[PDB]
Design a protein around this nucleic acid. Sequence first.
DNA 1: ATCGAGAATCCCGGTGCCGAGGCCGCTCAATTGGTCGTAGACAGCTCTAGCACCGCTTAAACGCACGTACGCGCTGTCCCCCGCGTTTTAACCGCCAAGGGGATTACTCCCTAGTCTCCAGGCACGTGTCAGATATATACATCCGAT
DNA 2: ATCGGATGTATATATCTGACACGTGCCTGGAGACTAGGGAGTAATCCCCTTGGCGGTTAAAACGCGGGGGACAGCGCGTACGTGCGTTTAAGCGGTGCTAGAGCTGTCTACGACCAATTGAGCGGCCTCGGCACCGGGATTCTCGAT
Lengths: 108, 109, 99, 99, 148, 82, 83, 94, 93, 85
Amino acid sequence: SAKACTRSSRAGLQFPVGRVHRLLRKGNYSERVGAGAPVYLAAVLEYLTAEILELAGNAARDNKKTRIIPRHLQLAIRNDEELNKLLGRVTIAQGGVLPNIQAVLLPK
Amino acid sequence: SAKACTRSSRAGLQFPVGRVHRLLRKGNYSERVGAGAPVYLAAVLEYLTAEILELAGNAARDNKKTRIIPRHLQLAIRNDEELNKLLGRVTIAQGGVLPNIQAVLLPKK
Amino acid sequence: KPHRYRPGTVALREIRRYQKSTELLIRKLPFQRLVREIAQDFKTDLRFQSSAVMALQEACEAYLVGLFEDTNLCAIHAKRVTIMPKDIQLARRIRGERA
Amino acid sequence: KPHRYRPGTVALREIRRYQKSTELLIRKLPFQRLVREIAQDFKTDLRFQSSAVMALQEACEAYLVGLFEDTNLCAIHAKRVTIMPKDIQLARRIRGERA
Amino acid sequence: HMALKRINKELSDLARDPPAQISAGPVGDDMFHWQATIMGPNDSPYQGGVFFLTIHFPTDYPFKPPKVAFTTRIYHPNINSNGSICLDILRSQWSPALTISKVLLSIASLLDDPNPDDPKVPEIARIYKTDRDKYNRISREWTQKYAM
Amino acid sequence: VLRDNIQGITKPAIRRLARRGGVKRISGLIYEETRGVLKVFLENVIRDAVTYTEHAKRKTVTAMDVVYALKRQGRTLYGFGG
Amino acid sequence: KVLRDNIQGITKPAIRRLARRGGVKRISGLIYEETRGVLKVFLENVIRDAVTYTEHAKRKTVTAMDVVYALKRQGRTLYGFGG
Amino acid sequence: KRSRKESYSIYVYKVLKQVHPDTGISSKAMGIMNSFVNDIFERIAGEASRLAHYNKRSTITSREIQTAVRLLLPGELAKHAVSEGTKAVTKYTS
Amino acid sequence: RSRKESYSIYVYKVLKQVHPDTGISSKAMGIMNSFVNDIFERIAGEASRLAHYNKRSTITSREIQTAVRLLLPGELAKHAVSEGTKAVTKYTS
Amino acid sequence: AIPSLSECQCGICMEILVEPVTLPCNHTLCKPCFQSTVEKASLCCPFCRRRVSSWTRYHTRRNSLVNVELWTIIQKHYPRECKLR
DNA sequence: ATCGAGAATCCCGGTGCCGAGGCCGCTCAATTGGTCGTAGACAGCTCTAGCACCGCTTAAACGCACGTACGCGCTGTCCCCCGCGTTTTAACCGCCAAGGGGATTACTCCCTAGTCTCCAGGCACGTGTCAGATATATACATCCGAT
DNA sequence: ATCGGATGTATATATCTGACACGTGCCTGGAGACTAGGGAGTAATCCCCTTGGCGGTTAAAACGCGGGGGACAGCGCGTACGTGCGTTTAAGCGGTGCTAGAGCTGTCTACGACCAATTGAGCGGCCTCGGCACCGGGATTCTCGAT
Ligand SMILES: [Zn+2]
Ligand SMILES: [Zn+2]
């Protein structure tokens, strides 16, 4: 890609590449840090963020609301298999639990 | 102390202090490393090793043996309380299991 | 003559009500007092940020809800509907908390 | 006239025998073949150090022994002595292995 | 094959419906290299300004965006000295369903209203944004040097 | 000095937690067991929180100490920073 | 040189021996298929990470240290084979 | 003025307005998103350094990050995240 | 060739201090080496996180003391802290 | 009742539909085009520009990408055009 | 199989308020240009151990028959949680008031990193002998049918 | 409650073999002396936010009662699992041969760290209006005793 443009818009991203480069270069990870690692890591982070935000927005719209709240975040995360497996030991504040009643308890 | 002997002997330890200092320096933990961290770490490691070796030697003696094998280490770790909690997720190769049978399964009197 | 609900149909209503909400089900002042009591058992003359107490409440409530889900499954395993202390003990043992 | 034990005593004898020893209870060639089959399902033309197969066997056997302990506890909880697949499923779910 | 079949009907669609103030065609032997001409929009300081541009089609089409460039000279926050266009349609948000007519019309739409948020050259963007009225004289000037 | 504050976890509160957990019928001996397990969990978390506070030479248990203590135990919490 | 259906090499007596060490006195007849399925799932999960570790280092031989690293990653530390 | 603190608020908001143009986000949801991004960053960048200490390297490249993504994310997330990272790196270079 | 290092000789010295007549096999020695390495990694990582939290750039003895307190259970932690403090005090003078 | 050939074209190919995939936005495209656009361009539908990443992840594991009904209807009507490919 | 009455929940419309979205000023961190020491990529050579095949024992696996004891369904009893009404307790909200200690800033000094020289501790290799495993033969504990 | 076989497990003795503990060469990593500078310790000031108190109002808790449904014990059936024996299978062991790939050494070239100047991306503080909370009334829908 052509130079003379900001690093984040050179790679087509939205998350910062300079900040990620600094964080990788200051967090006691390795002696040296490659040039392409921040781009890869920022792309992965942005992909995950958009992935969760799409489902959260859908869940918010299904409630006739126009603002994402932690309840919609957990409704999105816990209903998706890969996202639920990725965050399975994580508690989301003010999120509640999914509706689930055992079939034995229902009246006969 | 005398500032003349070896670092391990100056602190009264048998575990190395120069090797621990190097491992702490080259492990990508912090930019700087103090001069008292390796001594403290070596002391802690030696204490834990001595505890486990004492218990394993007792377990070997109970079996009329003069050589610790992984079975005696497993018995020593599992039969304890703090050592079993410190090594809850650890698998010992050739260690076996602690013998027990649930009271329900035993034959009725 | 007065109207009564059969035993069991008000419990499911509460299940559906409390599974649909997100608020905290424990009163805040008693929980704060208990937290302060335990902390002063650990170290005397302690002060607490309100965010710390709120985080403790959230964590404790999430833990208790998960434990009660596991307890319910344990009780259903033995062909019951009521939950008993043995269910909690078995769930905690299998999860490895008490062993 | 011929001597035979009542059903149950030889099982306890086997329990006492296999809890006192430390060898591996699975034959080594079939396990090696299974490991190689799975690996070639992942990547083709792979080679295995003998220590790798040995470590895999040790880990798998330890995991199965622990799972069977949990299964036995689940079976006993329901006033039984036999272990059934629902016991394995309940132990796995409570452990979080399948949820 | 696939790409050439796409380009032939793209050219046919452009020919049967000539876009207003934009024309395009093949200049080389093949259809990979194309030339085009754009006329200045009515509500712009580019009155009576002709701009020539050349475009190359990558080997994989339309899954990769085509390459556009300006042979002539124009002053723009999104266009540098070499004439390259800094448009999100061209590089980032390119959709394979987009045709050559849509992008060639979006070029003129950008000419109507330059985008200063993501400029290829920063100082030109600063000069454009600080005040339009002061620069408008230089805008016509640049038109007479090359466009006129 | 505070004493006997474990009884602020009332029977209605435990019933509400069980209802959110999906429980339909509850025996009368479950509340003391719930109180015991809650006390053990609170002690375990607060010990690590106070250790983190003391290492930093502070006198107030911030939310960061609680978040770090929860993360150290495998109970990561989202919402209070970190 | 493809190998097929080798999971039957974990015979019923072997599973009975594992249960006996685990402390099981009486076994149902449907346990064996369930045990085979669980063992296959566990083996796949471990071997995937082991092969990933050996692929990163540009090798063709799955060493023991790769298996130890994978086991540590999954939360089951193993003492005896290195580390 | 208080000391400057850094967060991913503006970037998460840009992503949100890219995916859902007419949807806003509250403050607690933003504080949960920031924690999620921080946690995943720590996970990937910390498990990608053991991957270099194992092989006696001293540089973290885009080959350690790709493998860390492969190991940490589940089956179908690790096929899309890797593709997105490779696409971003390729776009950055050329 | 190449040289590979281990804690074998120090483990043997500690064993000879504890049980003067017992020996140790090779598999047990490997297990002990793995245990020592694992505890080293645990304590060092906890100390690194502790130093990072307080905006420090050094791992001192109190970092290791707090890490030992966090990791080891009650009596083990108490005895380990006592032993480490004694070793440091004997070292500094 | 029976759809004609006008609605049986791939927007990217401008050819006959092969292995159709119908996105949640009801945008039908042939499988190779979907694979190429997913791999290279945007991970979004080329027509109305909406994100279909979660749908793709869900339906790739379960092997439900192809629209069975439309493919069944199409395959019987035009055997020769499909053979030409 | 149903009809109807009492009760809980969902929709809809109108009012209000506070927090989320956007703007403005500013300062510090990311960018660009340039230089340099070394990390690792590549080529070549060694040689270790992973793979394949063959033959012989014999140990573990398999298949079959008999019986028994354990799982599972059914019935009965009783007592203990549940739903509901009345009364008592203290949680929650708004408000004011004081001061501890978290957070920031400035100065300084001393602890640690980096460099060079040197030398001995521990690692690889070789060797002898005794601890434990194996085979063999008694001695005793334990189980089951039958009085 | 034993008593007798009958079987399995425990106990004592010869022996022999290979792995563990010790000894030797040496070389690479750790110890010792010196210099420079930035990190952290200490003192001082600010002001935020934590603790404590009071009054009200009312939502939530505590207590008592009547009763229906669920937990638990007891019986009976039969069917699946345990024990034992004869037979078929392929695991285990030893031995040999081959070569693929892990491992080590030598060059050298390009990538990443470090430093100085600079300015715009992003953070803190303010402001405002609309999204969501709340109140009140009506429509919809389970729920249960009675047929
Ligand atoms: Zn197509
Ligand atoms: Zn679409």
